[PDB]
Amino acid sequence: AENLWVTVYYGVPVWKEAKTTLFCASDARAYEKEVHNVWATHACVPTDPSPQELVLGNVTENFNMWKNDMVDQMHEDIISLWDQSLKPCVKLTPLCVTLICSNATVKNGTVEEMKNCSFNTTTEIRDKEKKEYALFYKPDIVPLSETNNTSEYRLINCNTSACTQACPKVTFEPIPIHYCAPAGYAILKCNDETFNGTGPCSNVSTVQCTHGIRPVVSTQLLLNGSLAEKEIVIRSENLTNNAKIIIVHLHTPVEIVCTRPNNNTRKSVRIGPGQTFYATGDIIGDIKQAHCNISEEKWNDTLQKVGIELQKHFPNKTIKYNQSAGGDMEITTHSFNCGGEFFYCNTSNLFNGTYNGTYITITLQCRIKQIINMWQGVGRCMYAPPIAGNITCRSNITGLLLTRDGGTNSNETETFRPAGGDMRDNWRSELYKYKVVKIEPLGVAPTRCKRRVVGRRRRRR
Amino acid sequence: QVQLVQSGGQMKKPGESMRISCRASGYEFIDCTLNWIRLAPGKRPEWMGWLKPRGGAVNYARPLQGRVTMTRDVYSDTAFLELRSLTVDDTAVYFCTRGKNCDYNWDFEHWGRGTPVIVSS
Amino acid sequence: EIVLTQSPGTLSLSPGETAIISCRTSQYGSLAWYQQRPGQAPRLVIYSGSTRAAGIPDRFSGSRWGPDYNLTISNLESGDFGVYYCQQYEFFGQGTKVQVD
Amino acid sequence: AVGIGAVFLGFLGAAGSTMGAASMTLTVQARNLLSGIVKLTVWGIKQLQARVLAVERYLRDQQLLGIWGCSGKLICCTNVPWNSSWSNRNLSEIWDNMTWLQWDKEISNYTQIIYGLLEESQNQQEKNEQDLLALD
Amino acid sequence: AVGIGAVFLGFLGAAGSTMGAASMTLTVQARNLLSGIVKLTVWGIKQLQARVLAVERYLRDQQLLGIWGCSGKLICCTNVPWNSSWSNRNLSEIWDNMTWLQWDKEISNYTQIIYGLLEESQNQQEKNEQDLLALD
Structure with missing residues (x-):
């Protein structure tokens, strides 16, 4: 036991478990592709050449891949990005017309799956229509019931919900994406590859951003x-x-x-x-x-x-x-x-x-x-x-x-x-290494120092 | 107001197929793993293959895998069980159950009315 | 090797008196109890060992011995008699029944 | 490290070090906490609802240091004796064994109590700051 | 209250008290002014256009305290004699009758003038803390 006085002391590194939405950063020059992509934003421009790293000294911390909220965040991220990049594109609604279909004759033979379907469509002036034909390369077109005619098919989008096509202006790409923490948070990383999902990891390393993750x-x-x-x-x-x-x-x-x-x-x-x-x-x-x-x-x-x-x-x-x-x-x-x-x-x-x-x-x-x-x-x-x-x-x-x-x-x-299974699993297989923790510069720790005395300046004490 | 609706009683004879319904009512989406259980009187109850309607997955569990076929219909919050070639032994009450909460689904909290199906020799 | 065993078979007990039901196990895993009166939809009683389900008085509980489980009940009134089933992960035991004297 | 030198990822190794080394080169966290690294869609709103939270937390911490007399000081002694029940009363003998991350548990409960005495130790200066015959 | 104690809704009672009590326990306003309590619709943008204004006002006040030579000080004297025309030149025996809220009218007009004198009260210190004469 010894005489002690409180000491505000801080600027210290100490962390705790937490949850918070993250910042995205795509690798290399790929942001110039990311100007127009789905499964990549508009745009996760990288401000630094991530990831820099250190091996923490004698630190052991708990991990969990199943409770991990980063997969839960990126599921919403990807689904919102998908919907919003598809949103302004041309809708397909007026095609749902009674399709007359037949065996798709092809050069020197007959193809196995598809059906050659022809239908009425609207020309430029809404008061007239013309006959058009397309080869839907899936046999999945429902034959309309209530008829003995075994050829009046229907596109199956209109059975349950209208749809939209993907604009060719944008392209599906599994561009790698690096997750970077915002200010005041650190993304810990475990390097022991024997880690079987849950338990301590005793080679913990910190990084600015996660390694290469592609959402394929x-x-x-x-x-x-x-x-x-x-x-x-x-x-x-x-x-x-x-x-x-x-x-x-x-x-x-x-x-x-x-x-x-x-x-x-x-x-x-x-x-x-x-x-x-x-x-x-x-x-x-x-x-x-x-x-x-x-x-x-x-x-x-x-x-x-x-x-x-x-x-x-x-x-x-x-x-x-x-x-x-x-x-x-x-x-x-x-x-x-x-x-x-x-x-x-x-x-x-x-x-x-x-x-x-x-x-x-x-x-x-x-x-x-x-x-x-x-x-x-x-x-x-x-x-x-x-x-x-x-x-x-x-x-x-x-x-x-x-x-x-x-x-x-x-x-x-x-x-x-x-x-x-659920799409979260595919990314969770690649995102088992990371956590998100907030750095808390704590409060008061004891020292043998003494009071400040009217705000007087002193040396070592 | 979350409970499961089940129907309904029907007699059968050996060799024929069979069908049972189950529906989620007063409940938003059936993302969480619905189930089937057989409460045969006088014998230890059996657990049959579940259903997970989001992906539509299934897992035929017991030696019933040679007969069981299960489907769903996400746009009506309904699930269907079908059996082929009912033997005399398969007389029992079929219960449509759901887990207490979506993490540990095996703790069946919500149970159906127990649709009976007796098959006579 | 996964097999369950419940004992005893059936009972005749006076209302308001205790009862004891045992459920064994042969693997590391949770446990839960289901009660079944004749006909009606069976009900959850306790789960995850000793934790208790919603809307049940403290008549029913038990202990997790590790390699075995013991379920003991107290002040079993006539309305609460029924058939009790033990659960794991898929395996349902042969069950036990308690009947009103 | 000694002096400062170091980086955020050149000093964060102190998190498992003895408290002696962590006491030195204590600054880079204060440099990191400000902003760090950072058609409308999911990329857009996140640089605001997260950035402003970080700035808010930093201002909160600076305010709390501002009240107690420790404004602009990385290290700050104060007039509050250390009560027995809060921790080891001889930690000058013991902090050589403990990293901060393990230390935080041992006083997690008593921080809110200690702030109450620390505020008084600060604001007793107000009575002395004014209103009697200190001639100069 | 005495010492500090109190809350925002435990100290705001000073708003009608004699100014003597308000000159004590003057702290919780600083703790309150920062954050307090706080598909897209009316809930969303309000957390940004409101929070940032509060942070902006707080930084404005802190800067204005910084320039005058009162950074990190709840209470701060300066080198400006009080001219008789602005208020009672004997408020030391009168503020025990007046609350702050009623006091504010008596110097609302002359508030803008006095900053122009605290600025020179600072920059005279600026001139004094530099040049040649004081060898050490």
Whole structure:
């Protein structure tokens, strides 16, 4: 014990848990692209070459990837950006007309999926109309009931909600986005890659801004993600819980090549006074239907590694991967955007096979859709115009999304199904490292110093 | 005013299919994981595959996966269960339940009226 | 290995007296109790071990021993008799019934 | 660090250091808290509803330092004895073991109490500041 | 109140009290003037066009205290004799009868003139604190 006096002392670093909306910063020159994009703002211009870093000395702090509010913030950010960038574009409403449709004859053959549909449309003067034809490259057009005529189809937007097309002036792009804290907050970061979702981390580092995050969307598979450096990681709310989810990160990527062999032709249609409508006019080449290719020699080994990783948590239980679960078309099929188009794939052989984890070219047939909801699944309908010529995608698979079966199978067997989920999960797989804490320069701490005495100046005391 | 509406009683015979409704009423959006449970008298109750109507996902749980097929309709706040090839054993009361709150859904708070379905040999 | 077990089978007890129901477990996980009178929609009683549901007096409660659970009740009046079921994550035990003397 | 030198991300390492080093080079937080790094859509309103909050918090802190006589002083002794129950009464023997982040818990409850005595220690100067026969 | 104690709605009773009590516990107004209590519609823009005005007025007052040679001081004398025409030249025996609110009228007209004398009361100090003569 010793004689002491209060000492206002401050300017100190001490932090606490908090929540607050963040500031966005896009990487490199991409802001000049960001002038016109969706999934990128207008515009997250970077004021500094982020991220600068230090390793904090002997600091350990709690983390949590599930309670993390940054994913919750960026979900609202992306959905608002999507809606507002789509808002001023041309609406599609007057096309909902009785479509007469037939087999889509093409050069030296007949195409497999689509239907050649012709309909009445409004010319420039509203008092007259003309016959026009377009090739909707999806069989998804509902045949109108109440009629024995088996050809009077309807566009399915008008069944439930009017829609809007994406202006070609703006483009879908997964531009990387860095989140930067506002003034007075620090974004802590954990560097221990063994972090399995929740618990202490003892190599905490601070940064001005988060690392490269790109908002790319996919279901049943992650595209262009970031890999755990050492081993394949498993993360979950609670594995023994039948519900919730299991997120997996691969140790090395596996190349996915996806392409659209049909040579489409972009066509214009004059629906209104300045409103121009884009549709696939005519196919000018051979037909093979869209498909994707994955090398089996890497991917089988990838399943075997993830299988032994699963068996670590599930002792002596053999792992079965089996068919996709069911339900809607957006999660029974691998969805992923590419080049303004949308691909849907059946997962032909991305599920099958039993692999004990002890060691005792794949083709995907893919459909294509023009009219989509946001993968949110209730929001605004969108029309994506066709892209001329072939489209080719090259991307790196990095993580899988799984859910568990149960709960009265024979105790020695267990089954996992590839099934997507809420869009927050895709970003949460990449945003597991960060927190947001407010710096609080605190109040009073004791010292052996003494009073100020009429405001008198003194030296050391 | 959040509760679940269920209907309705109906007799059946072996080999045929079957359908049961469930609806959320007085309630905004059914984002949170609705469920089904079977309260068979005289035997331990069984839990069947849930439904999560936002994504439309599903998880056929027990050896019922060989018969069960489940759907929903987000634009009417309604969910449907369908069974194929009802055996005599499957006589029970089917309950449409929801979690206490959307974090730990397995604590079934809200329960339906218990639509009975007896199948006679 | 995931199996539950409830005991005893059935009871005949005088109203206003206590009763005891046991529910075992074989994995780390939560627990909850459901009560069922004949016919009507069953009801939540307690969950997450010892925490109590809304709109229930303090007649019903229990303790989490770690590898087992014990549910004890007091002053069980005639109106509150019924069938009680134990829960985990999917597994429902065979249940127990208490009947009015 | 010694003197100042350092950066925000050149001094923040003190957060786990002994209190001796954290006592020195205490300034860069006071330089960081002001503004830091920072068609209408989501990018727009966030530079106002967040910026003004940071400025408001900084003005609040400056006001609180202004009242107690510690205006414009990074370090400021004051006339309030340290009561026994608030903390260790020999922390000159003990702060060499404790970082600030762990220290804050040990006095989190008593800060609002200490401000009450600190305000009095300040405003007793008002009576002395005026109204009797200090001849000069 | 005495010492400080009090609240905004525990000290504002001085508004009708004799000026002696108001000359004590004069602090909570500074603590109050900063923040206080505080799809797009009427709720939104009001938090910005109102909060920023309050912050602006507070900085105006702080700057005006800074120039005169009264920064960080609740109470501050200056070097300006009080000219008889502006008010009672014996208020030391009269302010015990008057509250601030009624006092303000008696010097509302001459308020603008007096700043012109506090400014020279400052800049004479400015001239004095520099040049050659005082070697150390």
